[PDB]
Amino acid sequence: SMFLPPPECPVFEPSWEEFADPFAFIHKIRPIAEQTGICKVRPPPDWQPPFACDVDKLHFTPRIQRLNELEAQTRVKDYTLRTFGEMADAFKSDYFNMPVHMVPTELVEKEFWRLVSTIEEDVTVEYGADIASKEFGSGFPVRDIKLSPEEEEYLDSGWNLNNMPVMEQSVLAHITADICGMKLPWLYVGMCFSSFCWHIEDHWSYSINYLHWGEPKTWYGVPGYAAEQLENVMKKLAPELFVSQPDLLHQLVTIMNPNTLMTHEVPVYRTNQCAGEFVITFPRAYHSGFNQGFNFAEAVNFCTVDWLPLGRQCVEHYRLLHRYCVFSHDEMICKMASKADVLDVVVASTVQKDMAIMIEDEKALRETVRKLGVIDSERMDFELLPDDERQCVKCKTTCFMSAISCSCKPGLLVCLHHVKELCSCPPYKYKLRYRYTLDDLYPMMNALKLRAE
């Protein structure tokens, strides 16, 4: 009745030995956590990263948020940290007529789900969300300014979210294109009820979230295997969310009661993330939540070797949806292959397998377009073109292995799945533009094998 909290997601308390290597640890808990989509990680009691900031010199531009269930919000779009904190505490204090920390978390949760489902209430809140910048930096130590001995100890921690993307078992650790959205941490300043709508990460990546300080962040998570179930429920109740969008900056997302999902047989788990704790989201695991009060979090995307095959599947799914890519998965694979001699050996082995599938798929595609009567061809360094100059006109995929052009429509490309979609000219007028021949690729494949042994 009213709100039934979902069951608790898994909570892990690794020893320092377990904890020291984030990638080994994540791989370890994966059979458990991937069944629940999210999990919480409590670091060893003495892992205590130093937090320090001047609340008067940190500025940011707030986003405003209406709180209505099923209402469309867009994924992306001046306070000091102090003036925001004052506004945030006053809001929670006045809303509940209580001291801001005496408000029970159970109560804030039940109240959140009441207020979002009521048309009459028009509660609006504000929050901060931006990548690390010079005007507002990471909450973790970074090199620059003389650091304290305590800060230096955490500079190279695997769990320092600045390091995670560039560590050795990370797969995005070598991507050329400056995907600032996916290897840089994001900073989040929350207040009571400010919420993150249901979503999955770009390219179905992992995310790792650290709550540096403040009141808890409440999470709901859904395991990856249930992603399409959830989408079907949402399509049915809010179809306006699923119309086509002109770019990445136009994704539509919404607040939705997890009990609604649970009624439709979608497994949902919850947690309250407190200061000093990590939440990890797994590939294609839907998640949402809201902040209990004034707080400060930091989060980053990442991709492990476990993720690589899912990344390929995600881009295929993006193609089916005519959804824009953040980067080319094939380009990332080939970039790594080209650096095989310095790859971690397990990484080399995993990349080799994805590359084999890529090559077999590419062979079949090239044979198909040849049979359609595309004969002329020319090598092309796709990686040099801005993304918006190499997207398939039909399905918006970022091209890299190959594409079709026609002199009839200068600058336009289709991927090889959409050869019929470029123009009315006969295919013999087309050119196949390709990055590699088979012969270019097999030394790269062999290098990976040698590195992998």
Ligand SMILES: FC(F)(F)c1ccc(OC2CCNCC2)nc1
């Ligand atoms: F996977 C690549 F290496 F890119 C690749 C794959 C296939 C290809 O052409 C095939 C298919 C058409 N006949 C010759 C072999 N050329 C290059």
Ligand SMILES: [Cl-]
């Ligand atoms: Cl409302």
Ligand SMILES: [Mn+2]
């Ligand atoms: Mn997320």
Ligand SMILES: [Zn+2]
């Ligand atoms: Zn296409």
Ligand SMILES: [Zn+2]
């Ligand atoms: Zn043409």
